[PDB]
């Protein structure tokens, strides 16, 4: 039948176009692909002045609010803090969250099984005028974090600046690239701010802009902590010039249920010696932590992947022809 | 022959069941899978009181034994420490390991090529009553770590509490999940300990339980250091409700030969100013390094993977039928 | 035709050797492969003495120039530093890089939009004899990074010693390995330096040798910072003894353009209390960031991958025979 042969030739040309256009060209079969080794450095620029009640103003700079100082892909920026200063070791009242005692007989000498705050001496001492708590041995100024400041102390960190330097290298093709592309210059970095459409290559990011692109509000996050993830994609074709290779930045907000464990917080202490006595300042910091992940793949023309793709296409063509012949046989 | 056709139809139905059940249903070929972006936060709750010989009691809290105080997937929990306090710069005797001298002529001014402890002034000064060492310029109190306390100072850290908050997000399908699930509530988080069978969803882990699940005794590791790895798997099917998505926690113990460099140890110093002089307290810490790795994928139904799997199954069926016909022809 | 059958048998034997030799033996298709969980610890041993102008000699040890003192795969080794000591919070002249004022009217009370150095009080005070800058409320000793020392202060770090402890475990085959192979012993670790050909198994690395293997000169990097990446490959065959499993070390230099943001640098501060006043010492550190990445494969013989490879080879053989018959028919 003539129409049967026409349909056969149609299937032939269809599978030919499929194997020549989709596999070979669209999927870049004619090339070999390799991954990269990446290194990320972060630098924050911004200053925050916080005026605590009954205390002098405190200035926080790059060395203050960025917790990992050397610089890492995962870093925490301080947004709010509860400060307990002049902590010294002694026998003193514990926090009421641990337990409340009405008499000394209720207290038991030892340490609490869970969430221990110290070694209970065995006496019930008044924590304040109303309630009394067990006397424990430890840092006498107890961090009381029941009250969290509604306005963020380091609210200016909403619009500070962040510079991310990402250096990637493909060793298979021996090609090293950096986020500071040829289009980016010094005068550009002097005044540019990153934008999704306007300034994609600008390496200067605003923290509030990053949080908004992630899908979260900075003010709510700065109150109790947050998690933002920055993904850097280096997908490019090495057949073209190296100037075409440009990184793509994506922002995601990692959040959970608000009623259970909201935000991100940690406790750190600074130890010093004053008047011959060892003391420490404790800080419970709620901040927005940024995790940077870089993933990229470089593909360059090679003869062996091309030959393998040609062989696979010939095999698929043969299988399709055999299946079409079996269908026409009925 | 009828038996030939029976065997042919048998092979046909076998390969049909294979392509319809294994590749499609079992391997979830109709679904497409995507990776996740994950962030991990750790919080330690526990307190250790250490009484050193000829020194007042020392209290260690979350700020103390957690050196990555900011919060990272890889963190070290202090289990034992050797303390050298009141280190000041000056010309003093070095450790015997660097070298033992009997006269000043044996000493050579300069710095050691390997394991340099300081700048040798060139005079042999008595390190103690028996042996004499080269005088070097540096921290005068030299840390002597020949004696390691057999009972772990922070042995209570065996049964402290650890809270791990893991937030994962699959960008393609735009689904965000957290280690805390609907089954987990606040009252549950108040009092629960993780177990492989009893409490698989409890986010509170005991350090001793974590180490024992890794096949390691807590005492021997805490004495000289250890390495524990926690892997979090988020394998789930997005065709069902998100409530079914639950993570799986697995514990591994990374250990080496005991005679050659046993355990994990590091050294850190705290600098301060006392009486107008800059001094420091040095600590050689033997602890357990916890490395947290999160790996998971999400699979959801899609039409293009379904069509590709159907095409591949039809092709495999055709190839199998052709091979069976060729075998029957022989 | 006889030659037709000869060519058919030739194609048959060729595809048979291909499926049995390349797909089965060469690619190890009969072996199933699994990944590993790895942990890396770093220890630096070196001493550097720096004599600043008008200041006493400063000694830097492992606790000093290793800012990630706890021990991480990514660590920074200090090579040069600019020190601004005795910083106190007050009203003082700002750095001239922010702005230069000729009168008090030019100053505006508030904070700078970009690169803010403090809160301007609206007064123009002389920064030095020639120029005047805006008066800001912050740390009064201003870090002036215009002059960078041409010779690296911590130049000795060129030939210090780095020890890496890498513990890997393949969970599927429950096999744990460490970089301290059977060939390496304690006496060997006492005196050895890693070499690409001479001492591949020695776990002691010289920083200068590591940087030179990455194609970078240590002097120019130590002057203003650098980035080195160490990759550890654990590819091995579990069919043989575990002694044959040995790690391979590769070094990659991650560098960028020199005119635009050269090297790696960061700022850190040490806070203390002197004479009842809280002060801090600021340090701008230019160092070499070492990023350690470990990736490995373990292959062990299994029956199911063997059967799958045999089936795939039989299918490819059948397809090749069918295609050859179709070509001969033409
Ligand atoms: N977080 C940031 N926000 C805005 N600009 C930045 C930031 N980090 C760096 N820059 C700008 O990028 C340029 C190159 O950065 P580089 O790493 O060389 O810093 P630097 O000049 O050594 O340090 P500093 O900027 O403190 O003098 C600098 O001139 C600086 O002004
Ligand atoms: N390591 C831990 N061990 C036991 N319980 C913990 C731990 N970390 C947190 N929790 C409990 O989980 C609950 C929610 O955790 P969240 O991150 O909000 O702690 P928090 O309330 O900010 O810190 P804290 O309980 O110290 O004030 C808290 O009520 C706390 O009691
Ligand atoms: N960075 C390094 N350079 C040279 N040798 C090292 C280095 N780190 C460790 N070693 C040597 O390897 C041996 C085993 O390492 P181990 O982890 O036991 O060190 P350690 O004895 O705990 O610490 P230290 O040697 O500082 O007292 C030690 O005897 C030490 O001399
Ligand atoms: C004392 O502390 C408890 C702690 O919960 C608090 O409820 C109470 O209001 C406090 N009383 C006063 C007078 O501050
Ligand atoms: C937002 O950025 C602007 C810069 O024009 C700044 O004036 C403002 O204070 C920033 N907002 C906050 C809350 O800091
Ligand atoms: C600086 O970079 C920008 C990139 O947007 C470019 O348009 C501009 O021409 C550059 N400046 C110079 C002087 O090349
Ligand atoms: C002196 O120190 C050396 C160091 O090895 C030690 O062997 C010796 O016993 C010490 N002597 C005394 C009296 O402490
Ligand atoms: C183990 O946990 C129990 C809690 O019941 C505690 O009493 C005990 O002290 C812990 N062991 C150590 C060595 O801390
Ligand atoms: C708390 O969580 C546990 C999980 O085991 C569950 O059994 C219990 O019902 C929950 N409590 C409430 C009040 O929902
Ligand atoms: C004052 O500081 C400026 C800052 O750029 C500098 O150019 C100038 O040479 C300095 N003058 C003196 C006398 O130090
Ligand atoms: C290089 O190593 C040698 C060891 O023989 C040492 O003498 C020299 O000081 C080192 N170079 C530097 C710059 O430290
Ligand atoms: C120490 O290790 C080296 C590895 O190069 C080996 O040649 C030597 O025999 C070992 N020493 C002993 C005593 O086994
Ligand atoms: Ca860190
Ligand atoms: Ca750190
Ligand atoms: Ca002090
Ligand atoms: Mg609380
Ligand atoms: Mg030692």
PDB file of C-alpha atoms in Angstrom, chain B residues 67-68 76 89 111 114-119 137-139 227 231 252-257 260-261 263-269 271 273 278 280 282 289 291 293 319 322-323 326, chain C residues 37 39-41 43 45 47 49 57-59 61 63-64 69-72 156 160 165 167 169 171 176 178 180 184-186 189-193 204 270 272-273 314 318-319 322:
ATOM      1  CA  UNK B  67      32.801  26.203  70.116  1.00  0.00           C
ATOM      2  CA  UNK B  68      30.709  26.788  66.960  1.00  0.00           C
ATOM      3  CA  UNK B  76      32.463  20.030  68.404  1.00  0.00           C
ATOM      4  CA  UNK B  89      55.188  36.416  76.497  1.00  0.00           C
ATOM      5  CA  UNK B 111      63.489  28.492  65.127  1.00  0.00           C
ATOM      6  CA  UNK B 114      59.346  21.190  62.547  1.00  0.00           C
ATOM      7  CA  UNK B 115      56.867  21.633  65.415  1.00  0.00           C
ATOM      8  CA  UNK B 116      58.460  24.955  66.323  1.00  0.00           C
ATOM      9  CA  UNK B 117      57.624  26.016  69.855  1.00  0.00           C
ATOM     10  CA  UNK B 118      59.354  29.399  69.685  1.00  0.00           C
ATOM     11  CA  UNK B 119      62.525  31.324  68.910  1.00  0.00           C
ATOM     12  CA  UNK B 137      60.739  33.278  73.287  1.00  0.00           C
ATOM     13  CA  UNK B 138      56.984  32.822  73.477  1.00  0.00           C
ATOM     14  CA  UNK B 139      54.245  31.928  75.912  1.00  0.00           C
ATOM     15  CA  UNK B 227      33.778  11.569  65.309  1.00  0.00           C
ATOM     16  CA  UNK B 231      22.575  11.677  58.159  1.00  0.00           C
ATOM     17  CA  UNK B 252      27.632   6.482  61.953  1.00  0.00           C
ATOM     18  CA  UNK B 253      30.885   6.380  63.918  1.00  0.00           C
ATOM     19  CA  UNK B 254      34.018   7.549  62.116  1.00  0.00           C
ATOM     20  CA  UNK B 255      37.037   6.049  63.870  1.00  0.00           C
ATOM     21  CA  UNK B 256      40.598   5.074  63.049  1.00  0.00           C
ATOM     22  CA  UNK B 257      43.390   2.959  64.463  1.00  0.00           C
ATOM     23  CA  UNK B 260      48.154   5.917  65.333  1.00  0.00           C
ATOM     24  CA  UNK B 261      46.640   9.312  66.198  1.00  0.00           C
ATOM     25  CA  UNK B 263      40.530  10.565  68.614  1.00  0.00           C
ATOM     26  CA  UNK B 264      39.896  14.174  67.649  1.00  0.00           C
ATOM     27  CA  UNK B 265      41.599  17.063  69.440  1.00  0.00           C
ATOM     28  CA  UNK B 266      42.260  20.757  68.910  1.00  0.00           C
ATOM     29  CA  UNK B 267      43.680  23.760  70.755  1.00  0.00           C
ATOM     30  CA  UNK B 268      42.295  27.254  71.350  1.00  0.00           C
ATOM     31  CA  UNK B 269      43.242  30.277  73.438  1.00  0.00           C
ATOM     32  CA  UNK B 271      43.050  36.345  75.286  1.00  0.00           C
ATOM     33  CA  UNK B 273      44.188  41.906  79.726  1.00  0.00           C
ATOM     34  CA  UNK B 278      48.085  40.903  77.868  1.00  0.00           C
ATOM     35  CA  UNK B 280      45.835  34.205  77.607  1.00  0.00           C
ATOM     36  CA  UNK B 282      45.197  27.957  76.510  1.00  0.00           C
ATOM     37  CA  UNK B 289      32.962  16.134  66.260  1.00  0.00           C
ATOM     38  CA  UNK B 291      28.972  16.125  61.269  1.00  0.00           C
ATOM     39  CA  UNK B 293      24.559  15.787  56.422  1.00  0.00           C
ATOM     40  CA  UNK B 319      13.316  -5.593  21.429  1.00  0.00           C
ATOM     41  CA  UNK B 322      12.381  -9.486  18.264  1.00  0.00           C
ATOM     42  CA  UNK B 323      14.972 -11.392  20.303  1.00  0.00           C
ATOM     43  CA  UNK B 326      15.174 -14.701  16.518  1.00  0.00           C
TER      44      UNK B 326
ATOM     45  CA  UNK C  37      30.384   9.835  54.566  1.00  0.00           C
ATOM     46  CA  UNK C  39      34.892  13.951  58.141  1.00  0.00           C
ATOM     47  CA  UNK C  40      37.986  16.162  57.909  1.00  0.00           C
ATOM     48  CA  UNK C  41      40.077  17.585  60.756  1.00  0.00           C
ATOM     49  CA  UNK C  43      45.899  20.780  62.678  1.00  0.00           C
ATOM     50  CA  UNK C  45      51.971  23.453  63.572  1.00  0.00           C
ATOM     51  CA  UNK C  47      55.349  29.686  64.890  1.00  0.00           C
ATOM     52  CA  UNK C  49      57.172  36.261  65.340  1.00  0.00           C
ATOM     53  CA  UNK C  57      57.237  41.389  69.387  1.00  0.00           C
ATOM     54  CA  UNK C  58      54.032  39.406  68.885  1.00  0.00           C
ATOM     55  CA  UNK C  59      54.031  35.597  68.792  1.00  0.00           C
ATOM     56  CA  UNK C  61      50.858  29.997  67.249  1.00  0.00           C
ATOM     57  CA  UNK C  63      45.658  29.026  68.313  1.00  0.00           C
ATOM     58  CA  UNK C  64      46.381  32.440  66.782  1.00  0.00           C
ATOM     59  CA  UNK C  69      40.297  26.761  66.011  1.00  0.00           C
ATOM     60  CA  UNK C  70      37.669  24.049  66.558  1.00  0.00           C
ATOM     61  CA  UNK C  71      38.691  22.361  63.307  1.00  0.00           C
ATOM     62  CA  UNK C  72      36.825  22.526  59.998  1.00  0.00           C
ATOM     63  CA  UNK C 156      57.190  31.846  57.933  1.00  0.00           C
ATOM     64  CA  UNK C 160      54.773  25.505  58.390  1.00  0.00           C
ATOM     65  CA  UNK C 165      42.883  13.611  59.359  1.00  0.00           C
ATOM     66  CA  UNK C 167      37.852   9.549  58.090  1.00  0.00           C
ATOM     67  CA  UNK C 169      32.954   5.300  55.697  1.00  0.00           C
ATOM     68  CA  UNK C 171      27.673   2.817  54.740  1.00  0.00           C
ATOM     69  CA  UNK C 176      35.529   2.539  57.414  1.00  0.00           C
ATOM     70  CA  UNK C 178      41.220   6.719  57.279  1.00  0.00           C
ATOM     71  CA  UNK C 180      46.460   7.103  57.886  1.00  0.00           C
ATOM     72  CA  UNK C 184      51.960   5.200  57.179  1.00  0.00           C
ATOM     73  CA  UNK C 185      53.313   4.682  60.701  1.00  0.00           C
ATOM     74  CA  UNK C 186      54.163   6.843  63.689  1.00  0.00           C
ATOM     75  CA  UNK C 189      54.593  10.780  60.570  1.00  0.00           C
ATOM     76  CA  UNK C 190      57.425  12.005  62.805  1.00  0.00           C
ATOM     77  CA  UNK C 191      59.525  13.082  59.785  1.00  0.00           C
ATOM     78  CA  UNK C 192      57.794  13.300  56.398  1.00  0.00           C
ATOM     79  CA  UNK C 193      56.608  15.964  53.965  1.00  0.00           C
ATOM     80  CA  UNK C 204      51.992  16.239  56.565  1.00  0.00           C
ATOM     81  CA  UNK C 270      39.061  40.892  70.284  1.00  0.00           C
ATOM     82  CA  UNK C 272      38.443  43.036  76.603  1.00  0.00           C
ATOM     83  CA  UNK C 273      38.107  45.223  79.697  1.00  0.00           C
ATOM     84  CA  UNK C 314      22.459  -9.436  25.402  1.00  0.00           C
ATOM     85  CA  UNK C 318      20.523  -8.532  19.629  1.00  0.00           C
ATOM     86  CA  UNK C 319      19.961  -4.961  18.447  1.00  0.00           C
ATOM     87  CA  UNK C 322      19.235  -6.999  13.820  1.00  0.00           C
TER      88      UNK C 322
END
